Amino acid sequence: NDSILLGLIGQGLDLSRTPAMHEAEGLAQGRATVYRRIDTLGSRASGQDLKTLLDAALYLGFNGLNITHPYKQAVLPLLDEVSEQATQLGAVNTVVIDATGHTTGHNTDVSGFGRGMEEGLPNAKLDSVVQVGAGGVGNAVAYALVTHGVQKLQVADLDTSRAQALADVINNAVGREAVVGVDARGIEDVIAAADGVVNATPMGMPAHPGTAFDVSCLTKDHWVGDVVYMPIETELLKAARALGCETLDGTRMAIHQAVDAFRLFTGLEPDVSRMRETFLSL
Amino acid sequence: NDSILLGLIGQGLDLSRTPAMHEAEGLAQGRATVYRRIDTLGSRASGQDLKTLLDAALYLGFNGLNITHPYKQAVLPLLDEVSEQATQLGAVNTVVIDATGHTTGHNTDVSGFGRGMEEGLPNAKLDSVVQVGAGGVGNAVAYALVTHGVQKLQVADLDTSRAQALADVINNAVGREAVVGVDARGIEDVIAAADGVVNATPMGMPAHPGTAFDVSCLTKDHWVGDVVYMPIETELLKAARALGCETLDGTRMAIHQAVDAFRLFTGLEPDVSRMRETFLSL
Numbered sequence: 293n294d295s296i297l298l299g300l301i302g303q304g305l306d307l308s309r310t311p312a313m314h315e316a317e318g319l320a321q322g323r324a325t326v327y328r329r330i331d332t333l334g335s336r337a338s339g340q341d342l343k344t345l346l347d348a349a350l351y352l353g354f355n356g357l358n359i360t361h362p363y364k365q366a367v368l369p370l371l372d373e374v375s376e377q378a379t380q381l382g383a384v385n386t387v388v389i390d391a392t393g394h395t396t397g398h399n400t401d402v403s404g405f406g407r408g409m410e411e412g413l414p415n416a417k418l419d420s421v422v423q424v425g426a427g428g429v430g431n432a433v434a435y436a437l438v439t440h441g442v443q444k445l446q447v448a449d450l451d452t453s454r455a456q457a458l459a460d461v462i463n464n465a466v467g468r469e470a471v472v473g474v475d476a477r478g479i480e481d482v483i484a485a486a487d488g489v490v491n492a493t494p495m496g497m498p499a500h501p502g503t504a505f506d507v508s509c510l511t512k513d514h515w516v517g518d519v520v521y522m523p524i525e526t527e528l529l530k531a532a533r534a535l536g537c538e539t540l541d542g543t544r545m546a547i548h549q550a551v552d553a554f555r556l557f558t559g560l561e562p563d564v565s566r567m568r569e570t571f572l573s574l
Numbered sequence: 575n576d577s578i579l580l581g582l583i584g585q586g587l588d589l590s591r592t593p594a595m596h597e598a599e600g601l602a603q604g605r606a607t608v609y610r611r612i613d614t615l616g617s618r619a620s621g622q623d624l625k626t627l628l629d630a631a632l633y634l635g636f637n638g639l640n641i642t643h644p645y646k647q648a649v650l651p652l653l654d655e656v657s658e659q660a661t662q663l664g665a666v667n668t669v670v671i672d673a674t675g676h677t678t679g680h681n682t683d684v685s686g687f688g689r690g691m692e693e694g695l696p697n698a699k700l701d702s703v704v705q706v707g708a709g710g711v712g713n714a715v716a717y718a719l720v721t722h723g724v725q726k727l728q729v730a731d732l733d734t735s736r737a738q739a740l741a742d743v744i745n746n747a748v749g750r751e752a753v754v755g756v757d758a759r760g761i762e763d764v765i766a767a768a769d770g771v772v773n774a775t776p777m778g779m780p781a782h783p784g785t786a787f788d789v790s791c792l793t794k795d796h797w798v799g800d801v802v803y804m805p806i807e808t809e810l811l812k813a814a815r816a817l818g819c820e821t822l823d824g825t826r827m828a829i830h831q832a833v834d835a836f837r838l839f840t841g842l843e844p845d846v847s848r849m850r851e852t853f854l855s856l
């Protein structure tokens with residue numbers, strides 16, 4: 293029944309649903325919980341280096357942090373220890389801070405997305421999958437996919453440097469040639485031949501309306517995932533549903549990254565349904 | 575219903591009752607509240623300067639701090655603004671942090687002790703009072719006394735430099751010669767002639783058993799106060815009670831400094847009875 297102190301270091305955090313999820317679940321477990329935005333574009337932490345903010349959290353009794361863009365790679369060398377998976381991906385989103393200020397990095401984007409696939413696509417065929425988008429979120433998603441039984445993942449990005457760098461990182465992490473960079477041009481025919489496809493681009497968001505590829509390449513037998521969670525039903529997922537495809541919406545990763553982080557931070561077993569209800573209520 | 579984040583910068587804080595008081599009252603008002611020790615002898619904040627710790631609180635979203643020994647004077651020049659009373663005493667125990675990291679210093683030791691006198695000694699005669707002890711707590715107590723209608727306060731300390739420096743500070747703060755330093759040797763006869771006496775020394779504590787002066791100098795007509803709050807009934811207050819004297823125990827200031835700080839930090843009206851019950855429960 294000791295109180296819990298957490299925060300998120302990142303940029304442009306006002307609309308994040310992560311603080312609310314953690315504050316509600318700590319309270320539901322009888323533990324007063326504060327989860328603060330630490331926004332380097334905002335009114336308190338502007339102009340401060342990542343190491344200053346991390347050090348501050350240590351000194352003033354935080355039990356953990358999340359880390360988001362543009363800090364998930366930069367944070368690694370600052371930490372005392374880093375999980376195998378976070379090390380091999382080269383990205384940390386969760387920092388557990390023990391009673392002395394010792395830090396351990398983890399990656400709950402990877403574990404989160406993996407859990408979403410178990411929960412939402414238990415019967416999906418995983419032999420051949422396409423992922424469109426090789427940014428930050430895409431890096432974690434690809435890792436999750438190929439450690440969760442995807443045999444061959446083809447990753448396309450408008451920026452070829454990003455897709456190949458992704459492939460190299462993941463293949464090293466898993467010890468086999470699981471991932472292949474492919475061209476974005478003509479991606480539809482690649483998708484058509486695969487078992488499933490995941491959008492890991494901004495397409496579908498209000499400010500990026502549409503889809504990353506022509507949905508006419510989908511068939512009823514495909515499964516389709518999307519990282520975008522606002523709106524939950526993206527134009528891509530609506531097209532997929534219209535055909536009868538199984539779909540994996542973006543709220544599953546979003547919720548599970550927080551479930552997994554709360555467990556890491558506190559040692560408590562989070563209630564997934566309550567954290568899901570918090571998320572959807574915002 | 576925004577969560578509240580507070581802490582205490584000081585040394586040797588494990589047994590402080592202040593965190594528990596604030597965490598309980600925030601929760602009773604429907605506001606998840608974390609109040610962290612920031613102990614420069616402890617496992618997280620050792621070796622760090624006061625300015626580093628204050629800055630850290632700003633960056634990571636604290637709504638306020640308390641400040642205790644040896645930092646209540648040192649903190650003043652670090653703050654953006656300081657209350658009249660805290661300025662004139664030269665000591666701050668409460669720092670309100672607004673939404674940008676702007677800081678205002680206050681002194682709730684002074685307001686606390688004053689409120690205790692109103693609550694616990696409403697009918698006391700205040701023409702002539704003696705205070706034994708001119709350290710930190712004594713400085714706040716003396717200020718409270720002479721702004722709350724004490725005409726002449728005689729302050730004794732084994733260290734004469736401390737009693738005279740106190741007198742000079744307070745007399746400047748209040749604009750009259752309210753306080754006079756007197757010798758500790760022979761203080762009993764000075765007490766005997768006065769209306770009331772306040773112990774502001776460590777005497778009475780478990781590790782400092784006894785009294786700061788011979789209690790035989792007391793009469794039934796005196797009132798007697800003590801800053802020591804463990805034990806609540808000090809040897810001094812037991813002697814005073816034996817004669818039928820009105821007494822002011824040290825828990826009143828301790829509780830009220832926290833009541834007044836919580837009001838400052840949050841804008842909420844604290845429930846004195848609940849914060850008193852938290853204090854006594856520890």
Ligand SMILES: NC(=O)c1ccc[n+]([C@@H]2O[C@H](COP(=O)([O-])OP(=O)(O)OC[C@H]3O[C@@H](n4cnc5c(N)ncnc54)[C@H](O)[C@@H]3O)[C@@H](O)[C@H]2O)c1
Pocket residue numbers: 361424425426427428429430448449450451454476492493494495497503504505519520521542543545546547549
């Ligand atoms: N569900 C969640 O938990 C969660 C969390 C954070 C972000 N997101 C979502 O993930 C999206 C991606 O985030 P990110 O941080 O990796 O963004 P990013 O901008 O770093 O990466 C997106 C990648 O998509 C590529 N891309 C864009 N359009 C493309 C197209 N038509 N074809 C192929 N590649 C294309 C870009 O070149 C870029 O490399 C965000 O826009 C947001 O909607 C979801």
Ligand SMILES: NC(=O)c1ccc[n+]([C@@H]2O[C@H](COP(=O)([O-])OP(=O)(O)OC[C@H]3O[C@@H](n4cnc5c(N)ncnc54)[C@H](O)[C@@H]3O)[C@@H](O)[C@H]2O)c1
Pocket residue numbers: 643706707708709710711712730731732733736758774775776777779785786787801802803824825827828829831
């Ligand atoms: N009620 C509260 O809210 C509260 C809060 C903090 C501390 N305290 C109590 O206040 C006490 C004093 O704290 P402080 O920080 O000012 O301590 P301090 O040690 O800075 O000052 C105490 C002063 O007492 C003087 N003194 C000691 N014995 C004396 C004697 N026999 N005659 C005359 N002077 C004597 C010392 O020379 C010293 O200047 C603490 O020991 C603690 O019990 C109470």
